[PDB]
Design a binder for these strands. Structure first.
Lengths: 310, 20, 329, 23, 29
RNA sequence: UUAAAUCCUUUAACGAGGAUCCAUUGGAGGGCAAGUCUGGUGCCAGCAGCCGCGGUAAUUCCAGCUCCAAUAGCGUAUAUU
RNA sequence: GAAACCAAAGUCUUUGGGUUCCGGGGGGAGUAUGGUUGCAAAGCUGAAACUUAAAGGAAUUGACGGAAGGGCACCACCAGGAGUGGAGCCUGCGGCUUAAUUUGCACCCGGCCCGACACGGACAGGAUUGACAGAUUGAUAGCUCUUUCUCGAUUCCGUGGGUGGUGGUGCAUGGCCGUUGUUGGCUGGUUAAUUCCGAUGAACG
């Protein structure tokens, strides 16, 4: 209701100096630069585990042995049944590498060596971007989590120079729908290999949140000794570099394809490939050591009468 | 089907809105 | 061979039927609705309506572990590993580890060239519990997957074969079951698995006939809790004969009088937005009279929602077969 | 004489505990 | 004032089963 | 051409009918040009610079079709006129 | 001039007589802090972070439960009368029961009867139509349950969210009824009776 003129409505009465700024900025800059310097020195140096580089070709035409021959300082070549991985030492650049490689398509090898690697080197075709096998590997790697990656092209030298420049343009156009701002490199000669190695050494490290909290280890050498041969079980001796955190015997060890296990001893022999050319301190008992109990251990009617007349 | 692009689309627009 | 293709056509037809009509069913003629949908109850406001999270827990939940405060426990363990120093071999040392009960075959996996990666876990990550993992379907694969078929999980340095349970990703207490994983949104896979602390990447693979694995779903771990309630919905449909002033006679919904007397005290709705409840069963052939909030048209169809908490299936297989290299289809 | 809502009163909620990890 | 107990189709006072016998309670001031 | 090249220009040869040798980016309630079309969701999911739309007949949400504006360009954030 | 109004609040887009103070959407807020004056109370100067699509001015009414005067009424009242509401009978709405207790004959319980498109099958080896009998049935009935007799392409089984058909309903639509004066002109049976039934036209205004 809006009152008229007869109702009474009284009208209301409308009654830091520039030196200190520069010093503060410099203090913050020194703190940030010191933290950055410590984090960059924590990887791949004299005090750290080797920089692990997973070389994945993305095409069937990529000659992986040629690329791994270009990439190898001092080379110490660990060999397996079919594949070979090599430790590289550059005392000129003062840096240690472990180059591993895997063809795309075989899922467990690429995923298991990608969850432990520090850098992934994606090899590219000069003409096309990648195969469908490479696209499947890329989908799996993107979904699992990408560490620091670098793209390198293998076959730019075979083409004529006009076609070299034009195909470099076309290759960047093709790749840019998945890696939008990434510089391609070239792998033709030894000096391009040296520039690639220097690029891999000095590069900001994408940090994977899962493996940073738990300890992990890539097996450099594994031996076995059976407790009972008929039982087909016994002590496994796995040797490699510790990467993530400080490991303890009071917590279990999982192998990715074989489940949980209980370590019984941890010893520290000599570093086989140190950069600049037996001991065990741990106690076993189950006062706080976890066990493998994944499941809880605790366990007058007539004959003719129907239901209506009933 | 595909659409005309460039001068042809403007020609089609002019024929549609002014000629008839 | 041909039976596999017939099953493929059957699964595609089921996918099309679920996509067209969400989870409608046809009522069994011979089996009574009382004994068929015995464990189904009707909710009033789905999300708001209170469902007890402890009613009818199965034997499988008697074998798993529970966190009274998962967030605080994870924060405490992360704070402890971040700040408090545990004695042992630290980062950068070339160590050797003697580990006690290991099968021989792992050695034959190393010797032919396969990589071998070990990782020392966190506490309470060996025990079995219920994992909820948010996933999205990969655009590269389009074959249908049903709600309780076995898949291969890559969850946080762990690979295992298990049967998930697909649910809608909401922030409420009750989550509706998704009978098929469709390729547009984010769903939740609920499964019995060992405890893994987030964050962790989650990959869902399907094993093909030739040994290949096709990437089905990509996502991340969401939580570790069996307190999540996954609810399966069953929708029953009924047709009105004739319309009075806010009164309708529904047929083809039940087929016995005792079935109508059973599913009486919970409310029904319509496809066009009207709402009503069963007044009284008219015939003893399932026909019933029911009142509404408004007079509905003759082409309108009435719907009834029944809800049942569904638990996942214990199909935890830690062994995953080694693939053949992936290639073109 | 049971219906959908009465039978839910006959559901016990104290039998199948999962083991609880405290804080 | 007993609106839940008034019959819609008739004048009178219809019983309900969930609630007790028909009535209407209003407070004082 | 040029230091030698590349590109442009000049010329042989091949090179177009779905001329698939396939033009995008934002919008269609008003401001402000362009739909009260159809399917889905039902104050939810969302849109919306602003006014506002969505609570079972959505001209405004998600889409199909159609239409509008600029066009090898067109949206968005910010500074400034 | 926004108007209330103003001989100034006029001499203003035809905009310049001189000069002082002072405002810039609403709040935070005349607040904090700093300065200054004061015995004190306090006075003077005075923010920002943040927050919001309004805040406000001029007059004008129009709805707006309602409020004050009257008029009328035994479906309003005073004075009454007959009463119902008390009991029984039956009748309507509710409610309760059941198969329904139809309704402001859907159905109870039974028995009957019967669309094309495409594709995959059977199809003259015969697809199919018509049945003597006996009975199932609540009764019969080839529309049924056993027994083979006949007509033979007139075919008959299933599946699709794609049309769809004695489909239903609304619009336009061609013909056609009715709707908006005057004068003429007996073979038959049957009943009291030229009785009953039974065959059986023209002009003028």
């Amino acid at each position: 209701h809006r009152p008229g003129p007869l109702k009474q409505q009284n009208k209301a009465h409308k009654g830091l100096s520039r030196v200190d700024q520069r010093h503060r900025a410099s203090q913050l800059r020194k703190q940030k630069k010191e933290a950055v310097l410590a984090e960059k020195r924590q990887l791949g140096g004299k005090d750290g585990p080797p920089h692990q580089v997973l070389v994945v070709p993305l095409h069937s035409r990529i000659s992986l042995p040629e690329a791994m021959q270009l990439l190898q300082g001092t080379v110490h070549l660990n060999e397996l049944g079919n594949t070979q991985n090599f430790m590289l030492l550059c005392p000129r650049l003062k840096h240690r590498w472990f180059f591993t490689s895997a063809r795309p398509g075989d899922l467990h090898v690429v995923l298991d060596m990608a969850k432990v690697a520090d850098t992934i080197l994606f090899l590219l075709d000069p003409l096309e971007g990648w195969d469908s096998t490479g696209d499947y590997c890329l989908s799996c790697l993107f979904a699992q989590g990408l560490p620091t990656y670098t793209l390198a092209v293998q076959g730019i030298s075979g083409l004529p120079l006009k076609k070299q420049i034009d195909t470099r343009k076309k290759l960047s156009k093709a790749v840019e729908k998945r890696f939008p701002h990434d510089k391609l490199l070239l792998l033709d000669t030894q000096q391009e290999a040296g520039m690639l190695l220097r690029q891999l050494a000095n590069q900001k490290q994408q940090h994977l949140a899962f493996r940073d909290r738990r300890a992990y280890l890539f097996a450099h050498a594994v031996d076995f000794v059976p407790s009972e041969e008929n039982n087909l079980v016994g002590t496994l001796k796995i040797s490699g570099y510790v990467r993530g955190q400080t490991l303890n015997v009071n917590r279990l060890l999982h192998i990715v394809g074989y489940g949980d296990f209980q370590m019984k001893q941890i010893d520290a022999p000599g570093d086989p490939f140190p950069l600049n050319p037996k001991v065990l301190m741990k106690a076993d008992p189950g006062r706080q050591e976890s066990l493998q109990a994944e499941v809880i251990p605790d366990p007058k009617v007539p004959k003719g009468t129907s239901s209506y007349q009933a | 089907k595909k659409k005309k692009t460039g001068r042809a689309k403007r020609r089609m627009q002019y024929n549609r809105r002014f000629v008839n | 061979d041909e039976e596999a293709e017939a099953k493929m056509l059957e699964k595609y037809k089921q996918e099309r039927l679920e996509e067209m009509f969400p989870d409608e069913v046809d009522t069994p003629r011979d089996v009574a609705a009382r004994i068929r949908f015995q464990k189904y109850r009707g909710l009033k406001s789905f999300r708001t309506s209170p469902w007890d999270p402890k009613e009818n827990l199965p034997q499988d939940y008697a074998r798993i572990f529970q966190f009274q405060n998962f967030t605080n426990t994870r924060k405490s363990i992360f704070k402890e590993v971040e700040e408090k120093e545990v004695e042992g071999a630290e980062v950068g040392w070339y160590v050797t580890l003697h580990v006690s009960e290991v099968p021989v075959s792992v050695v034959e996996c190393f010797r032919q060239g396969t990589p071998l990666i070990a990782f020392s876990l966190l506490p309470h990550e060996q025990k079995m519990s219920v994992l909820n993992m948010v996933v999205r379907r990969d655009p590269g694969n389009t074959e249908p997957v049903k709600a309780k078929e076995e898949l291969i999980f890559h969850c946080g340095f762990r690979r295992f074969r298990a049967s998930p349970l697909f649910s809608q990703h909401t922030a409420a207490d009750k989550h509706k079951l998704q009978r098929f994983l469709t390729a547009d949104m984010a769903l939740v896979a609920t499964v019995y698995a060992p405890i893994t602390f987030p964050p962790a990447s989650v990959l869902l693979f399907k094993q093909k006939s030739n040994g290949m694995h096709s990437l089905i779903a990509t996502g991340h771990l969401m939580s570790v809790d069996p307190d999540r309630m996954v609810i399966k919905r069953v929708v029953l449909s009924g047709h009105p004969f004739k319309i009075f002033t806010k009164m309708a006679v529904v047929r083809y919904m039940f087929f016995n009088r005792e079935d109508v007397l059973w599913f009486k005290p919970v409310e029904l709705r319509t496809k066009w937005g009207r709402r009503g409840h069963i007044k009284e069963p008219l015939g003893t052939h399932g026909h019933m009279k029911c009142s509404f909030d408004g007079k509905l048209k003759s082409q309108d169809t009435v719907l009834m929602n029944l809800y049942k908490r569904v638990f996942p299936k214990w199909t935890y297989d830690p062994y995953v077969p080694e693939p053949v290299p992936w290639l073109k289809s | 004489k049971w219906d959908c809502e009465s039978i839910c009163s006959t559901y016990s909620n104290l039998y199948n505990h999962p083991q609880l990890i405290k804080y | 004032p007993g609106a839940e107990y008034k019959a819609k189709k008739a004048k009178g006072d219809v019983k309900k089963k969930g609630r007790p016998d028909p009535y209407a309670y209003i407070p004082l001031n």
